[PDB]
Design a protein around this ligand. Structure first.
Ligand SMILES: [Mg+2]
Ligand SMILES: [Mg+2]
Ligand SMILES: [Mg+2]
Ligand SMILES: [Mg+2]
Ligand SMILES: [Mg+2]
Ligand SMILES: [Mg+2]
Ligand SMILES: [Mg+2]
Ligand SMILES: [Mg+2]
Ligand SMILES: [Mg+2]
Ligand SMILES: [Mg+2]
Ligand SMILES: [Mg+2]
Ligand SMILES: [Mg+2]
Ligand SMILES: [Mg+2]
Ligand SMILES: [Zn+2]
Ligand SMILES: [Zn+2]
Ligand SMILES: [Zn+2]
Lengths: 194, 55, 190, 58, 199, 116, 89, 355, 180, 87, 238
RNA sequence: UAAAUUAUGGUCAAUUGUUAGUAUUCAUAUUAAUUUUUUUAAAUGUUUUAUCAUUUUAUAAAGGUUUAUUUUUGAAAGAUUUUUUGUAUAAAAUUUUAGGAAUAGUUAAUAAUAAUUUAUAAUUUUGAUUAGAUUGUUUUGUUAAUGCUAUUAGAUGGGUGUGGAAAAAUAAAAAAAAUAAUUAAUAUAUAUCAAUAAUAAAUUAAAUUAAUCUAUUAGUCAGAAAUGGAUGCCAGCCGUUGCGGUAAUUUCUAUGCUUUUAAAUAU
């Protein structure tokens, strides 16, 4: 037992809490402001400097919303002709919206800071958003235009012709003729609205 | 077993591996593993009076 | 990318995502032995080379690798490997020099087992205590002579029988009866 | 247990570097790197062995 | 579920904040320099950073040893990384939980593009793929009309046996015609005939 | 014994990604730092005088190429690729371009002729 | 390199280099000016040198003594454990 | 590792997939999802499912861990020779690491690094660090040294106590010196006629009987030079009167008359009525034994024709600052030390007035 | 100090010289080329690993589209990206404590990152290099110069110790009653 | 696989040889006929070796050097090497 | 030579290359005929603009391709002359119909690619009408005056000083940029006033002036006169 | 010498040849390679300086080494007004040939000793020294797997001994003491040993900048696929049992027909 060497004094440190120190603080090393949302940082920076600090995220969000209401006001009536061979597609607005909603809700991009900004950034007329999409559903059902791609019947032979973002024409695939209204597509529109 | 090592047969490889086998290694009991027979009957006719300095 | 097939390859310059960047060394070359000598006359007395010779050390099958874990590291905490050795004293013909036989360990991972090899050292005992057949502790040190890096640190077991044997004027140990083996037949009678 | 774990070129299959510091002291190799004869073939031996296997201490 | 487990839908995130710039003594002479064509991302690496095992601890805004990122916008400013950009610097992670609704699975019929699925080019038309046993396709934006809780994830974590398998060998050595089960394919004809096709 | 060659040809489809074709925000770097051309000096009046006073090395025979440049602006409008199109050899065209950009920096091609 | 212009002092010699670096006073003045400008650069440069030096030293203090905290606790624990195992022994 | 055609270091930390242009799958426009999974991603072997290295593959328990808790106690021993070399190195590094480039704080750095390397920071190192830091007029870091020593459970010798009390006085913090006193120097005695004068070194130094060597566990045989073992023998010269003096100075500095009166009275009494303890010879490690040199090749005094250059052989410039011309305080008689003690107290009065 | 100098790759001083932070990569087709930020000695040998102090990072000189982040109507974010990995603890160590050197290209990089000011070689050829005369500079200096102690303390805080003790943590660290 | 039949390929798949003789040899029963055997030469490490191999090739206008490949077994015992083309 | 074999660079805009035998072969087997259903000219109800963008002279010369032979989806690359900005380019009809591809200059026509019409900026005809006359005259100057004053359009102008023609950007010329985009060089307006060759002399005037005044030049001057209540953080210096 | 639960946790080991009584890892399979194809290299003049000089500029020629290769700061980094310290050259492990014998400027003590100091010396059968082959201790291929099977290259003695360190006699792709230059990564037609290109190898077209290329083989008894015509133990086939005796589904030729489509064949 007591043969062979004396008992190292540092052993004491186990049984006596008096000797557990840390000479310095966590960030006294110069990192104190790392946590952007800590109370310490709110006390150091003050509020207006924090406003200055997050202005960039605020204008990110405002940018998303501004794009969204531009597309909505453009494509709101779903069927018209807005450009040379290009015409309105509700599908544009849809897919942008999905990009937005994925920025918020997805687990691959998870950018959730975007949602902390809504109580301020969010436009009052866009509060009802799915309502506006339903209104667009009602406008989408016009008879002169194809129920699938919403191109005009008279001036266009195929689904997706002269549309940049169309799903219906893929690279080495083939062209599909316009599809005609009838109970099928009527209840398709219906189920979408649902 | 690559065919170029040791002899042209396979079993020559395993015959030289028995030279490296762990439990086969040379010690105070097992000696002269590689040529036992050159040293055999070597001292038969060599007459050596054993060493005694104590009565 | 070593995980892609022969036909799956596109670019040879980079790894697209991650993984190991691997050079293929061509293992199957069908390398051969050139035979430059008659089977009768080979220009070496003790050994003959008739085939492709395996080369390298640690690249050598079956692999034999250094084993740090044995008796010596079991007892000692060594600052550097081989800084401590326990052994027996074999012979003292040299003043202030004790020769010491020591065991160390080799591991064959193929068969998962260890072998003990043995090696001789020259150790420096000033003051000449060590008698043949002592169990001694030995340490690494300053370069002393051409072959002596070791000194006798402590006698673990002295040889009491050998010392009393010396005191009487006799050799510590009887000289071995036969020397090294020969390939001749010595006929020596009476 | 497979071939991918044979490749030590991943950093996930290889004992990390810092071990050699923990044994010989920190920033100890910067000395060795400036040595006269280096890497032809040999460099000052780099000891990395998982610290629970160390023959010295354990 | 939504009422009882409010914290399972993340409503909070580390805000994108602009860093203060380091003073340039050279003044206007160099002010053009850090203002350029592109964005410049910089992620840190080192002994304490980049380990997947520790990933959340390293993205944790509470931890002061937290891995550091920065971005130079083309106008010369600097901002912290968006969370997506932060996550770009770790090996890609797959999240799919099978417990309530089926996650979308790779290497399916409607998923896999032609050349892996069949060894031939098959035209992609939105109407009547006989090979895929579908009558027609209306092609809405995938996650738009469906409910979000329904979207679960993707699973790539298996071998796509039609396409590529381990330890590929000939099923039958004779006759010489059979190959591994991944080689399925129609016979190529004697030399090709091209019929002009406006028709 | 493997005389037969590979079992399969692995090929991946090409299917254009709508996300990778999305419009890219672009700037021209001539907007950020505007390019300009320094007018000739009394020291260096012509492009040929220039190619004469940038001729130093035996192996950078700049003065021999005077014909491959029509005027002043032609010189400073050249970059290395388009400078290769015109058939100037290698280290020579690097001497030329180096000289030009150096003159742009405020350092005229004044240097001692090393040939002797 | 050290730039040798053509109006540097020409050395007339056939046994050696044709041009000695010796400056027209103009060249000296010029050189002084340019070098003042680069002085302006290197002031800030080395300023950042020593700034980062103290940064690194300070972080070393804090993290290393946090390390010594945790580590000492560890080895105190091990030592306690050992003397216990020896009482049991 | 780097710059080779096959260079592995560049791939060893995670990166987002690069499509700038056509990499052979025409990556600029091509959605690489299946190409990503089945080709680009490393797999366990050709044809097996992709091996996922992401954050979801490791368990949760990696982030439950406190810091540096993966470490285990490392006993690293080394040759005796090498201990001398290393302790010397750390000492001269703590004095100064670089010429004008040394920050005061660097002494503290080197002490800490010494611990991080699994060396024991012996007494010489502590005294040296404290004197260095205090002489740089940085007093918080000095006490930080002391706290490091306390956390390592190293029992301070009398010399070390002296140094720390010097730091206390100059700082004017009585509350440090009080705890330091109470903990360490209490039992400190003076020397009397019955005392034996400088006590012989009594320590064995550490060896192993062959049974101790063979039968003990690994740690019982592990000797790192540990300050605590010789503490008795560092104290063998009885520097006590210095400690009492310093303590008088502190109690004065912190503005307390009764305690000061106490220490100073004890000291006075002992100096009058008790023998003068034998002084310790100069410490080999703190101050170095002068080594022999010929002074022949030296820049002469007049070497520069413009001025008087001071030289290694002799000083021609003259003393810049007056020196007191007294031997080191320990060489005094007891009466002399009484006088010295009063002048010391006065000096502290002065310092406190200036603060 | 080589009798027959190696003519093509000369340097200054003996090798290995003071460590210098370089960018280097094996040469290949421009479409795949990457660079390595590396702290290494001044004199390289055949393989760059022989003298290599530390590995600072990968830098890819190809503007990339950001497919990692969601497509963002914000103008600036959809400029192309340039990706670089910096190890900044090692960088600050080597540069700051060990006093490195720097080639120009890595300097431009670390300038973009905000670790260093823009280099000496980055020139808007719009502006010329400035002039100087000492009397005007003197008038400006006499006009603005701060107090001695303010300046001394600024140099103190920047170069020497930063973290200092307010009277509060003193009062909180000094021992209480039983040993006080 | 029989590895000693390849002795003169010396770890190579194909060899270059020069024509010397062409003689005829009768195969092992029950196979009758005449097998044409070409007697060829080549040099390695400045040694000149005489190679003996089966002539299966097509001879056109007179030519000198052939290309030797090893096969499986043939009717004729003792002849390991076969002829690919003649140059 | 050797280096001829190298594949060109394919930037982000461009899809599939078709540079390899494998990539060429399956399309080599497609043979088109122009029927009544394929002919571009039949479809002018939709694609009328595309029809009036074709170079009818140049295509039949160089390509030997009649205008009645051109399919609405035609894969052949024919010459076009932009009916907006008036620049010539070579593309396939298929790519202009399937998506909109056309002259590369009119890609940058709007102030930002990301958001096409989202500008609230006035046209050039309004904000800076004095620019419309400096445009090199191809007859399309009324279309170019219609663009945003922030537009990134690459236009060619006739230099005031030497009367020659150079190429710069509309927004670079005006100096104005949209909120949230990258700031241009503060001096860009003065610097793009002329040729890249004619620009030096005029802009070196104020510098010579400032070294005439004080006998000393530093670029500092502007920032200095910018100097002749800012919230600031609490500091840990104490 | 008792079970266990607050329940799938600590993140994937998984094996595919049509053979010929039987015994024995052995022909014909897949993967990896050589056969096999010019999309990554490159040209000479290094450079200052105080002038016949002096400062800067340190490991790719060959030879064949298996108890073998080991080292500092005095150079530079590098910061002050001058004398500045100590630590280094040493070792331990791992070492090949089917049939095996002696090796030698030689060990240890003395010491700035001894071509003749002193001694009962040293290496070896636990495999030496000569001699063959061979560039040594994070690199590959196969595999479910302890294995088997690769890994280049780079340190070749001394003789006015310079230099901090010999690494010092073409063969860069390392900016080398004023910001040469960064709108740069392109280098024409050479080499060495490397560096996997038949890159949607076949129908709807290339959100280009249109540049390099005009691209084919095998089998046809057994085992996917046959008929004429010759030939007659011949000529020839042959991965293998074996085929060829006027009717050969196994030779040669013609024509068709067969293939699961980066080729057969050889190693
Ligand atoms: Mg293996
Ligand atoms: Mg093959
Ligand atoms: Mg062979
Ligand atoms: Mg046969
Ligand atoms: Mg050599
Ligand atoms: Mg040999
Ligand atoms: Mg050894
Ligand atoms: Mg050695
Ligand atoms: Mg010689
Ligand atoms: Mg059949
Ligand atoms: Mg045949
Ligand atoms: Mg017949
Ligand atoms: Mg027949
Ligand atoms: Zn339609
Ligand atoms: Zn246009
Ligand atoms: Zn002009």
């Amino acid at each position: 037992l007591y043969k062979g060497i004396p008992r190292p004094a540092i052993t004491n440190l186990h049984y006596e809490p008096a000797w557990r120190y840390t000479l310095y603080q966590a960030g006294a090393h110069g990192a104190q402001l790392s946590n952007p949302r800590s109370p310490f940082t709110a006390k150091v920076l003050g509020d207006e400097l924090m406003q200055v600090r997050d202005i960039k995220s605020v204008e990110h969000c405002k940018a998303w919303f501004d794009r969204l209401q531009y597309l909505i006001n453009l494509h709101y009536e779903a069927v018209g002709d807005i450009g040379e061979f290009k015409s309105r597609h509700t599908r544009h607005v849809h897919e942008f919206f999905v990009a937005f909603h994925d920025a918020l809700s997805s687990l691959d991009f998870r950018d959730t800071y975007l949602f902390d900004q809504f109580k301020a950034v969010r436009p009052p007329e866009l509060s009802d958003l799915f309502g506006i999409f339903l209104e667009m559903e009602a406008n989408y059902v016009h008879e002169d235009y194809c129920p699938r791609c919403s191109l005009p019947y008279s001036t266009t032979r195929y689904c997706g012709e002269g549309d940049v973002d169309t799903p219906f024409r893929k690279h080495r695939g083939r062209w599909a003729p316009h599809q005609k209204w009838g109970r099928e597509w009527y209840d398709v529109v219906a189920r979408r609205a649902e | 077993i690559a065919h170029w090592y040791c002899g042209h047969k396979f079993r020559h490889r395993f015959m030289r591996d028995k030279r490296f086998h762990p439990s086969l290694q040379a010690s105070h009991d097992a000696r002269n593993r590689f040529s036992k027979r050159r040293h055999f009957k070597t001292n038969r006719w060599n007459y050596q009076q054993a060493y005694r300095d104590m009565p | 990318p070593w995980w892609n097939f022969q036909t799956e390859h596109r670019q040879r310059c980079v790894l697209m995502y991650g993984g190991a960047r691997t050079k293929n060394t061509h293992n199957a070359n069908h390398r051969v032995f050139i035979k430059k000598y008659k089977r009768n006359a080979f220009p070496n007395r003790t050994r003959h080379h008739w085939a492709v010779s395996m080369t390298g050390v640690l690249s050598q099958r079956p692999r034999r690798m250094p084993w740090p874990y044995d008796l010596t590291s079991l007892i000692f905490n060594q600052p550097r490997q081989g800084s401590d050795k326990i052994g027996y004293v074999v012979g003292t013909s040299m003043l202030k020099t004790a020769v010491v036989a020591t065991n160390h360990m080799v591991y064959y991972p193929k068969f998962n087992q260890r072998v003990s090899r043995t090696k001789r050292f020259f150790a420096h005992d000033e003051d000449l205590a060590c008698v043949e057949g002592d169990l001694v502790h030995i340490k690494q040190c300053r370069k002393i002579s051409k072959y002596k890096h070791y000194y006798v640190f402590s006698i673990l077991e002295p040889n009491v029988e050998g010392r009393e044997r010396l005191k009487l004027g006799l050799k510590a140990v009887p000289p071995p009866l036969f020397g090294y083996p020969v390939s001749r037949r010595i006929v020596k009678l009476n | 247990s497979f071939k991918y774990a044979t490749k030590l070129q991943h950093d996930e299959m290889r004992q990390p570097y810092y071990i050699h510091e923990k044994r010989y002291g920190i920033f100890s190799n910067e000395r060795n790197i400036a040595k006269a004869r280096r890497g032809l073939p040999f460099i000052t031996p780099l000891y990395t062995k998982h610290m629970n296997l160390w023959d010295t201490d354990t | 579920y939504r009422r009882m487990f409010p914290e399972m839908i993340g409503r909070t995130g580390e805000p994108v904040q602009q860093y203060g710039q380091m003073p340039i003594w050279a003044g206007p002479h160099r002010q053009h320099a850090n203002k350029s064509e592109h964005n410049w991302m910089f992620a840190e690496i080192g002994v304490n950073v980049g380990h997947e095992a520790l990933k959340k601890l390293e993205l944790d805004p509470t931890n002061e040893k937290r891995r550091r990122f920065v971005i130079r916008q083309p106008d010369g400013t600097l901002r912290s990384a968006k969370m997506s950009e932060m996550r770009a610097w770790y090996w890609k992670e797959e999240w799919a939980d099978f417990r309530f609704w089926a996650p979308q699975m790779e290497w399916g019929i409607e998923n896999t593009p032609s050349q892996e699925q069949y060894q031939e080019h098959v035209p992609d038309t939105t109407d009547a793929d006989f090979r895929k046993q579908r009558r027609i396709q209306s092609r809405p934006v995938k996650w738009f009309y469906e409910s979000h809780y329904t979207r679960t994830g993707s699973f790539a974590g298996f071998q796509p046996l039609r396409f590529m398998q381990r330890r590929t060998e000939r099923e039958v050595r004779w006759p010489d015609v059979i190959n591994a089960a991944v080689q399925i394919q129609k016979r190529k004809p004697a030399a090709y005939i091209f019929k002009a096709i406006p028709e | 014994d493997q005389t037969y060659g590979p079992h399969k040809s692995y090929k991946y489809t090409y299917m254009p990604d709508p996300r990778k074709l999305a419009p890219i925000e672009t700037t021209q770097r001539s907007e950020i730092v505007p390019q300009s051309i320094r007018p000739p000096t009394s020291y260096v009046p012509n492009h040929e005088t220039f190619l004469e006073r940038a001729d130093i090395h035996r192996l950078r025979p700049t003065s021999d190429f005077k014909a491959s440049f029509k005027d002043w602006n032609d010189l400073f409008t050249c970059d290395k690729r388009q400078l290769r199109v015109r058939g100037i050899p290698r280290m020579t065209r690097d001497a030329i371009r180096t000289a030009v950009q150096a003159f742009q920096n405020g350092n005229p091609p004044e240097r001692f002729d090393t040939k002797e | 390199r050290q730039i040798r212009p053509y109006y540097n002092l020409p050395s007339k010699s056939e046994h050696g280099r044709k041009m000695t670096g010796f400056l027209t006073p103009y060249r000296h003045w010029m050189w002084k000016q340019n070098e003042l400008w680069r002085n302006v650069h290197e002031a800030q440069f080395e300023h950042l040198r020593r700034v980062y030096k103290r940064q690194w030293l300070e972080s070393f203090r804090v993290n290393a003594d946090e390390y010594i905290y945790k580590y000492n606790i560890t080895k105190a624990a091990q030592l306690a454990q050992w003397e216990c195992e020896m009482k049991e022994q | 590792k780097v710059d080779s055609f096959h260079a592995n270091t560049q791939y060893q930390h995670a990166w987002p997939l690069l499509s700038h242009d056509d990499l052979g799958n025409s990556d600029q426009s091509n959605n690489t999802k299946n190409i990503m999974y089945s080709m680009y991603m490393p797999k366990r072997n050709k044809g097996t499912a992709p091996w996922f290295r992401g954050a979801d593959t490791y368990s949760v328990k990696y982030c439950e861990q406190g810091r540096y808790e993966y470490q285990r106690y490392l006993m690293i021993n080394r040759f005796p020779s090498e201990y001398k070399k290393h302790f010397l190195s750390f000492l001269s590094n703590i004095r100064m690491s670089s010429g004008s480039a040394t920050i005061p704080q660097e002494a503290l750095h080197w002490l800490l690094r010494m611990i991080v390397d699994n060396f024991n920071p012996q007494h010489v190192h502590y005294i040296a660090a404290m004197k260095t830091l205090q002489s740089a007029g940085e007093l918080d870091m000095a006490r930080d040294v002391w706290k490091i020593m306390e956390r390592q459970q190293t029992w301070p010798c009398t010399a070390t106590i002296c140094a720390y009390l010097d730091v206390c006085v100059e700082a004017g913090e009585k509350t440090w010196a009080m705890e330091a006193w109470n903990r360490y120097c209490t039992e400190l005695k003076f020397l009397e006629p019955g005392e034996v004068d400088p006590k012989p070194i009594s320590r064995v130094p550490f060896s192993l009987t062959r049974e101790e060597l063979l039968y003990l566990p690994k740690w019982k045989k592990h000797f790192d030079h540990d300050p605590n073992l010789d503490v008795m023998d560092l104290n063998r010269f009885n520097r006590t009167r210095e400690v009492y003096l310093r303590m008088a100075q502190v109690m004065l500095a912190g503005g307390e008359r009764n305690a000061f009166q106490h220490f100073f009275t004890k000291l006075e009494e002992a100096m009058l009525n008790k023998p003068t303890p034998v002084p310790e010879p100069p410490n080999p490690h703190l101050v170095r034994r002068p080594r022999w040199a010929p002074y022949e090749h030296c820049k002469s005094v007049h070497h520069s024709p413009w001025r008087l250059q001071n030289n290694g052989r002799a000083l021609a410039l003259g003393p810049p600052v007056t020196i007191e011309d007294e031997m080191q305080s320990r060489f005094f008689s007891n009466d002399q030390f009484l006088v010295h003690s009063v002048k010391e107290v006065l000096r502290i009065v002065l310092q406190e007035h200036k603060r | 100090a080589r009798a027959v100098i190696k003519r093509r790759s000369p340097q200054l001083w003996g090798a290995p010289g003071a460590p210098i932070i370089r960018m280097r990569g094996h040469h290949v087709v421009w479409k795949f080329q990457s660079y390595d930020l590396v702290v290494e000695h001044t004199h390289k040998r055949r393989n760059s690993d022989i003298r290599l102090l530390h590995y600072l990072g990968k830098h890819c000189p190809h503007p990339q589209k950001s497919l990692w982040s969601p497509d963002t109507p914000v103008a600036q974010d959809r400029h192309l990206f340039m990706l670089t990995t910096v190890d900044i603890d090692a960088f600050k160590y080597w540069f700051g404590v060990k006093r490195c050197r720097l080639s120009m290209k890595p300097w431009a990089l670390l300038a973009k990152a905000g670790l260093l000011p823009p280099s000496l070689t980055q020139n808007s050829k719009i502006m010329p290099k400035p002039l100087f005369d000492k009397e005007s500079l003197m008038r400006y200096y006499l006009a603005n110069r701060k107090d001695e102690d303010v300046m001394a303390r600024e140099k103190y805080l920047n170069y020497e110790n930063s973290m200092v003790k307010t009277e509060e943590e003193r009062a909180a660290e000094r021992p209480v009653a039983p040993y006080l | 696989l029989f590895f000693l039949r390849m002795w003169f390929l010396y770890g190579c798949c194909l060899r270059f040889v020069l024509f010397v003789l062409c003689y005829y040899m009768s195969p092992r029963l029950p196979s009758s006929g005449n097998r044409r055997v070409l007697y060829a030469v080549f040099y390695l490490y400045n040694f000149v070796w005489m190679l003996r191999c089966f002539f299966c090739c097509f001879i056109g206008l007179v030519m000198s050097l052939f290309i030797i490949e090893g096969g499986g077994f043939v009717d004729l015992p003792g002849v390991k090497y076969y002829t690919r083309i003649v140059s | 030579s050797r280096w001829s074999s190298v594949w060109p660079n394919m930037r982000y805009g461009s899809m599939f290359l078709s540079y390899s035998v494998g990539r060429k072969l399956p399309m080599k087997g497609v043979n088109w005929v122009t029927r009544d259903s394929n002919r571009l000219l039949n479809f002018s109800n939709r694609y009328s603009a595309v029809i009036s963008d074709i170079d009818v002279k140049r295509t039949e010369e160089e390509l030997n391709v009649a205008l009645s032979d051109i399919r609405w989806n035609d894969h052949r690359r024919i010459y076009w002359k932009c009916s907006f900005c008036g620049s010539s380019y070579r593309k396939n009809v298929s790519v202009r119909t399937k998506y909109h591809a056309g002259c590369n200059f009119c890609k940058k026509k709007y102030p930002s690619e990301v958001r096409g019409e989202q500008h609230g900026s006035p046209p050039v005809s309004q904000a800076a009408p004095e620019l419309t006359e400096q445009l090199v005259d191809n007859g399309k100057r009324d279309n170019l005056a219609t663009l945003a004053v922030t537009s990134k359009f690459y236009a060619e102008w006739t230099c005031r000083g030497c009367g020659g023609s150079y190429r710069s950007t509309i927004r670079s010329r005006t100096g104005q940029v949209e909120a949230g985009q990258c700031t241009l060089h503060p001096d860009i307006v003065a610097w793009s006033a002329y040729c890249p060759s004619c620009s030096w002399r005029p802009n070196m005037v104020p510098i010579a002036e400032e070294v005439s005044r004080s006998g000393q030049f530093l670029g500092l001057e502007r920032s200095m006169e910018e100097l002749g209540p800012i919230p600031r953080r609490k500091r840990l210096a104490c």
